[PDB]
């Protein structure tokens, strides 16, 4: 239940690069402000979404 021999840097690198990989979220520019917002989410910069106000963005 313990490593038998230290793995090679190739194997460590391979595992690390494959696992520690985060995927980009999709985007779609807001119809109101033109910001690039996450697709299917309320715009975080102007608050609109499909031409409807839902937030009141502060500071």
């Amino acid at each position: 239940a313990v490593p038998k021999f230290k793995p090679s840097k190739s194997r460590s690198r391979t595992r690390r690069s494959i696992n520690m990989r985060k995927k980009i979220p999709q985007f779609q520019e807001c119809s109101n402000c033109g910001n690039l917002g996450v697709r299917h989410r309320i715009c975080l910069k102007c608050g609109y979404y499909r031409n409807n106000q839902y937030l009141e963005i502060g500071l």
Partner: protein, 121 residues
């Protein structure tokens, strides 16, 4: 494999799930608009729309049922007097849940739940 479709169990035992649903529905009726995790809001709307359709018709017996779930008297009266009379006609879909993104910190999926038509003031 999964049986028991119809819930999300909200990650908590049955009594605490029921209490959770009751409190969030109370708050939703009080405030007309709330923000929370998407799963919690989904279950909340499943029950809130049911309560509204049960309260479409105002009678003593119906009120006494709705009290078994709404334990705030003020909000029970509000639900029977100010909210439903604007959804008297609508065949369903009184609420609207819209996603908000991943929250910072623990990356929960936030969302906003609100009424399609605001009630009498």
């Amino acid at each position: 494999m999964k049986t028991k479709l119809g819930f999300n169990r909200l990650s908590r035992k049955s009594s605490h799930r029921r209490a959770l649903l009751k409190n969030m529905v109370i708050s939703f009726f009080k405030h007309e608009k709330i923000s929370s995790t998407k799963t919690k809001l989904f279950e909340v709307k499943r029950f809130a729309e049911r309560l509204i359709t049960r309260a479409k018709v105002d009678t003593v017996h119906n009120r006494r049922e709705l009290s078994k779930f709404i334990h705030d008297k003020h909000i029970l009266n509000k639900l029977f007097t100010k909210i439903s009379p604007v959804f008297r006609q609508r065949s369903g879909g009184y609420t609207r849940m819209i996603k908000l993104g991943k929250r910072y910190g623990d990356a929960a999926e936030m969302a906003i739940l609100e009424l399609v038509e605001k009630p009498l003031k």
